[PDB]
Ligand binder design. Structure first.
Ligand SMILES: COC(=O)c1ccc(-c2cc(C#N)cc([C@@]3(C(C)C)C(C#N)=C(N)Oc4n[nH]c(C)c43)c2)s1
Ligand SMILES: COC(=O)c1ccc(-c2cc(C#N)cc([C@@]3(C(C)C)C(C#N)=C(N)Oc4n[nH]c(C)c43)c2)s1
Ligand SMILES: Cc1ncc(COP(=O)(O)O)c(CNCC(=O)O)c1O
Ligand SMILES: Cc1ncc(COP(=O)(O)O)c(CNCC(=O)O)c1O
Ligand SMILES: [Cl-]
Lengths: 442, 442
């Protein structure tokens, strides 16, 4: 007793905006480090009827039957995750039901520590995620700072993790979990030294590798699996999967972590799984293991190294003066402009990037940087030669921002008033749209 | 640098299970009360490229830009939600980012009370959801029982909400939230009475209409908006949308609950929203408001009324001896078989249903009932006349179960041993599949 008209006919208002979004995405130099583009195969999963199914519990331990084919899919997804991260399904378990990275972290953290639980994570301003225990003085911003007791370590003035400060913190504060793996961190991680600090204080090692998952998979970067009790990743970023999360747990290092974590996901926090998510993670995970995806990951780093290089060739300062991964955080201080200002300037020329804090920063408001990353563009067929152009565009943006601030004022309200109608921005968007509009597009 | 190979050629392994799943669904009499089937237009959103975007924040207040088209998509969703639930956007707000009902409830609960806060909800065994503060003696099973201090009210032997008990409890325990709205409850709710007890104790009124959302929209059942501070609903059940949730808040009764609820969702709990969810919800919410969907909802109840009647005509006991909504809970005591067994008997014949507790029950294992509902089959186009046949199938299932329990014993695996190859179940399956396979399938 339903309507079966396609989306164009059924809701013309919506289909318009979705085709507009398509065009915007197609005609953008997308530098959001956390973004990517899924193929049609993954979206065919997310669009699949497999999501009609309530399948609470676990495969072979459902509450309902009729989950014959769902069980197979959940199992295939777990088979492939551990396969793809080169871990033995005898030493490592994986949960494939978490709905997103933020849910997975909260869930996994709760499993290890529980309420009033003590956790250590990197501060937001230093490159840590909200779910790593973020608070301001006035408010416990993340549940992770509220349902848990959280202390936060900073990076040094040069933007690097200070393992010394972690020790000072870990030994005195004495937490049950220490979190490593970050949201805007341009360098690789010394996990082994984290393992060294965790042992010293009997803490669990939590590695959230959401930004760098593919590197870890493709053995391009350090392996946290060698040293960590839990590892969480999102699937929608560099892994180029759907929006979802995976929780990995070392059965060997702490048996009965399986039940602990499998129950945190359900019934502690979640209800029915989203099978279309699961089905899509399955789909992307097949691709992850292939040596073709390894080419793509290498390409991401090649592009990032080249981009960093090209930005430095133009007298632009980077934090840590470079990158080990897919991401660069530009320091804007020498230019006397905010990341807030530059983000707007880039939006006007169809350049997606986000503002970001740096180490000298004191507020999440008025931050002195932007964060770019290469996974999306790499996916669109861009190579190292193309990086000079993006660098060129970012430099021009920066110059135009400096000009517009001089003409309208350091006040953001004022500044944006200078943005529309501007001759050079229209010129630059145009060049951007020209080049962007014609690259490969899943 | 991607593969655009379609699903059938990219991952043959997976496509097959999805094709198998598709077939099972097409050939099943689905009586899972919480299930439904989405049209191809809602699946077209879930598959849309809009999920590429990271848009942490709220519309007009993102942390990024290039959210021009997403802000519109999110805005149209909140418009249509408040429309559909017939509430004024001046009086009520809605959050459209919760990833599923359990996240929404956890989020909304937190917003109202926060850590170590006091909540009251119906017990699981009495019809309550896990997210309404469920614990057992041995463990706090839901986070809602652990990150909150929860107390649980039971229905009377008759299977109805004992409002006396709720006051006896609310006045002594004195919680800050009371939750009503249930997972397996066959009758309508007296919300006013709930409003009356909440006022006496200065508590919030939490109404979870996930199972009955459509009724309430279409004005077939009591309206919780008249009395409630928060209203949560999932969107994939009777509403027949994608898997997602809505949180509704009364601004006039509770000013500044907006920021409280909006910040609970992000950044307290979640990260990026899932814009395909949002896009799909929008799509369905348009459909919800049409006079045509009111037809479907009326049809649901018509069917459930007919099914109940038909079941009673066959000497089958229902809890509350009937239904006000889409769901029936059969009491199985006169037959001396558990729900668990009958579920198994039914899965064998492509009848999907679920074991459910009753008032006499004292364990969530070996419960004395099955919960059935009509939303899915009504979707297939079943009418009141078709309800005798389903009643007929369930009666026969119940009979065959008593036979198998007699032959192989009261123990589960033993009971299962009789299940495969049984002459009568094969005739009944065929019979099921024949009638089901030929019904309209979105
Ligand atoms: C009370 O809530 C808050 O104060 C905040 C919530 C989100 C905040 C934030 C602000 C900026 C800035 N400027 C940047 C972020 C990042 C960005 C990647 C977008 C961030 C940084 N810098 C880091 N490190 O982590 C993040 N997690 N989520 C988001 C949006 C961010 C978050 S501040
Ligand atoms: C430690 O975890 C547990 O004990 C349980 C988890 C889920 C449990 C459960 C058991 C049964 C049975 N029999 C039924 C449920 C229902 C069913 C609708 C599936 C339920 C009932 N009865 C109610 N009312 O609420 C529910 N929320 N989620 C699920 C699966 C259920 C939950 S018990
Ligand atoms: C370390 C980390 N963990 C989790 C998440 C995100 O979880 P969700 O899937 O719930 O958003 C992010 C992305 N953070 C935002 C960014 O990089 O832009 C992250 O960087
Ligand atoms: C009252 C209530 N709230 C929330 C949920 C489910 O939340 P998720 O969308 O996160 O699964 C249910 C369904 N519960 C299971 C059922 O009826 O089968 C429910 O009955
Ligand atoms: Cl989804």
């Amino acid at each position: 007793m339903f309507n079966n008209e396609p989306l164009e006919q059924i809701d013309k208002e919506l289909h318009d905006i979705l085709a507009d979004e398509e065009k915007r995405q197609r005609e953008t130099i997308n530098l959001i480090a956390s973004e990517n583009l899924t193929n049609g195969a993954v979206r065919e999963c997310l669009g699949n009827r497999v999501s009609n199914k309530y399948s609470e519990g676990y495969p072979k331990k459902r509450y309902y039957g009729g989950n014959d084919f769902i069980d197979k899919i959940e199992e295939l997804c777990q088979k492939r995750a551990l396969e793809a991260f080169n871990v033995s399904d005898e030493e490592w378990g994986v949960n494939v039901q978490p709905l997103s990275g933020s849910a997975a972290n909260v869930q996994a953290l709760y499993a290890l520590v529980g309420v009033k639980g003590k956790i250590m994570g990197m501060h937001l301003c230093s490159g840590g995620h909200l779910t790593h225990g973020f608070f301001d003085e006035k408010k416990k911003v993340s549940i992770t700072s509220d349902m848990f007791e959280s202390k936060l370590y900073k990076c040094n003035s040069q933007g690097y993790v200070d393992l010394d400060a972690v020790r000072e913190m870990a030994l005195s504060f004495k937490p049950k979990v220490i979190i490593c793996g970050y949201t805007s961190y341009p360098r690789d991680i010394d996990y082994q030294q984290f393992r060294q600090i965790c042992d010293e204080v009997n803490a669990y090692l939590f590695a959230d590798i959401s930004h760098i998952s593919s590197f870890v998979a493709c053995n391009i970067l350090n392996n946290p699996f060698l040293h960590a009790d839990v590892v969480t990743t999102t699937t929608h970023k560099i892994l180029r999967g759907p929006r979802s999360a995976l929780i990995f747990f070392n059965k060997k290092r702490n048996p009965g972590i399986e039940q602990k974590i499998n129950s945190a996901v359900f019934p502690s926090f979640q209800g029915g799984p989203h099978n279309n998510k699961i089905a899509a993670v399955a789909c992307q995970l097949k691709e992850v293991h292939s040596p073709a995806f390894k080419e793509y990951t290498q390409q991401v780093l090649l592009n990032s190294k080249a981009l960093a290089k090209a930005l430095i060739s133009k007298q632009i300062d980077l934090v840590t003066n470079g990158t080990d991964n897919h991401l660069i955080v530009v320091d804007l201080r020498k230019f006397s402009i905010t990341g807030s200002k530059l983000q707007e300037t880039c939006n006007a020329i169809n350049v997606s990037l986000n503002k970001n804090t740096i180490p000298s920063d004191v507020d999440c408001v008025s931050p002195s940087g932007v964060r770019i990353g290469t996974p999306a563009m790499t996916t669109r067929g861009a190579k190292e030669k193309d990086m000079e152009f993006i660098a060129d565009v970012l430099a021009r943006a920066i110059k135009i921002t400096v000009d517009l601030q001089e003409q309208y004022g350091k006040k953001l309200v004022d500044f944006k008033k200078g943005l529309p109608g501007n001759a050079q921005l229209q010129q630059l968007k145009q060049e951007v749209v020209t080049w962007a509009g014609a690259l490969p597009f899943p």
